[PDB]
Amino acid sequence: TRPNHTIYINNLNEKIKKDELKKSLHAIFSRFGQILDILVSRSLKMRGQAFVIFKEVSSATNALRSMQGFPFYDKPMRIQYATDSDIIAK
RNA sequence: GCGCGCUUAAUCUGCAGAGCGGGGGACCCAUUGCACUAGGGGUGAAUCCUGGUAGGGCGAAAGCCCGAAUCCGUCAGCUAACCUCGUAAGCGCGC
Ligand SMILES: Nc1ncnc2c1ncn2[C@@H]1O[C@@H]2COP(=O)(O)O[C@H]3[C@@H](O)[C@H](n4cnc5c(N)ncnc54)O[C@@H]3COP(=O)(O)O[C@H]2[C@H]1O
Ligand SMILES: Nc1ncnc2c1ncn2[C@@H]1O[C@@H]2COP(=O)(O)O[C@H]3[C@@H](O)[C@H](n4cnc5c(N)ncnc54)O[C@@H]3COP(=O)(O)O[C@H]2[C@H]1O
Ligand SMILES: [K+]
Ligand SMILES: [Mg+2]
Ligand SMILES: [Mg+2]
Ligand SMILES: [Mg+2]
Ligand SMILES: [Mg+2]
Ligand SMILES: [Mg+2]
Structure with missing residues (x-):
């Protein structure tokens, strides 16, 4: 629940492959800022x-607040804040 | 060495078939999981608590024992089709 550079999303459709899932997530979240x-x-x-x-954290916050509950692959996304990601911590 | 037997999927036929077993692997069902570095998982009765103990083997029974080992490699739920491997070894009686 503590603001982070990284947002954690769960409740995602597991039938969706890694590549497609990542492509769709990028497609949807890139508009909030640089990923x-x-x-x-x-x-x-x-x-x-x-x-x-x-x-940017501002992007993370806006993305989270805006996409919270979004119908994605027939399931409402559940979004929370991430510990910092390795890329950020380094 | 051979004849009965015993634990085990570990046995038969002339490396390969038959038989006996292990693992992966959809739809269906179950799983809501904080990661980017031991964790997770499989064969087996062999797991746990600090000698006991879950669980197993022989034996009609009472009683006698085992309660090991090791491997996949950061990954494996269920699962037809399908893909795959294992068939080592350790003993008890007799001649
Ligand atoms: N899969 C398993 N799960 C749990 N426990 C297991 C087990 N396999 C064996 N055990 C136990 O550990 C001992 C190991 O015996 P092993 O098979 O080396 O050696 C055995 C066996 O090779 C042989 N044997 C036992 N019973 C036999 C019988 N009825 N006929 C011929 N030979 C027998 O003589 C020895 C006597 O063993 P004993 O029964 O006193 O003790 C056995 C048994 O109690
Ligand atoms: N789902 C899984 N998750 C995690 N790890 C897994 C796994 N499946 C297998 N493994 C591990 O990786 C190895 C894979 O070889 P496989 O299981 O084909 O090779 C096995 C198997 O094909 C066969 N086997 C094992 N147990 C058997 C049994 N009870 N009956 C018949 N064959 C068996 O002989 C080999 C024994 O070697 P081992 O089991 O040490 O070797 C296994 C095991 O250590
Ligand atoms: K088992
Ligand atoms: Mg062979
Ligand atoms: Mg099994
Ligand atoms: Mg499976
Ligand atoms: Mg038996
Ligand atoms: Mg799977």
Whole structure:
């Protein structure tokens, strides 16, 4: 719940492949600001989740506030704030 | 060495078939998971608590024992089709 450069999204449709999911997430979130990276994994623990890392925290906050609850692949996205991502911390 | 047996998927036929087993792997169902570095998982009865113990083997029974080892490599839920490998080894009696 603490503001971060990286936003954490879950409740995502697990049938959607990594490439397509990342492409769609970039498509939707790039309008809020420059995206540093998008981490997606389909492992047992990490599936249904994604990490969108923004260049600016303001972008992260606006994206989160704006896309909170968005119908994405027939499921409402659940968005919270990320610890800092390795790319940012470094 | 051979004849019965025993744990085990570990046995038969002339490296390969048959038989017996292990793992991956859709739809369906279940899973809401804070990652970018031991974690997660598989064979087996062999797991846990600080000698006990879950769980297993022989035995009609009472009783006697095991309660090991090791591997995949950061990854594996269920799962037809399908893809794959294993068929090592350790003993008890007799001649
Ligand atoms: N899969 C398993 N799960 C749990 N526990 C297991 C197990 N396999 C074996 N055990 C236990 O550990 C001991 C190991 O015996 P092993 O098979 O080396 O050696 C055995 C066996 O090779 C042989 N044996 C046992 N019963 C036999 C029988 N009825 N006929 C012929 N030979 C027998 O003589 C030895 C006597 O063993 P014993 O039964 O006193 O003790 C056995 C058994 O109690
Ligand atoms: N789903 C999974 N998740 C995580 N790790 C997994 C896994 N599946 C397999 N592994 C591990 O990786 C190896 C893969 O070889 P595979 O299981 O084909 O090779 C196995 C298997 O094909 C066969 N096997 C194992 N247990 C068997 C059994 N009970 N009956 C018949 N064959 C068996 O012999 C080999 C034994 O070697 P081992 O099991 O040490 O070697 C296994 C195991 O250590
Ligand atoms: K088991
Ligand atoms: Mg062969
Ligand atoms: Mg099994
Ligand atoms: Mg599976
Ligand atoms: Mg038996
Ligand atoms: Mg899977």
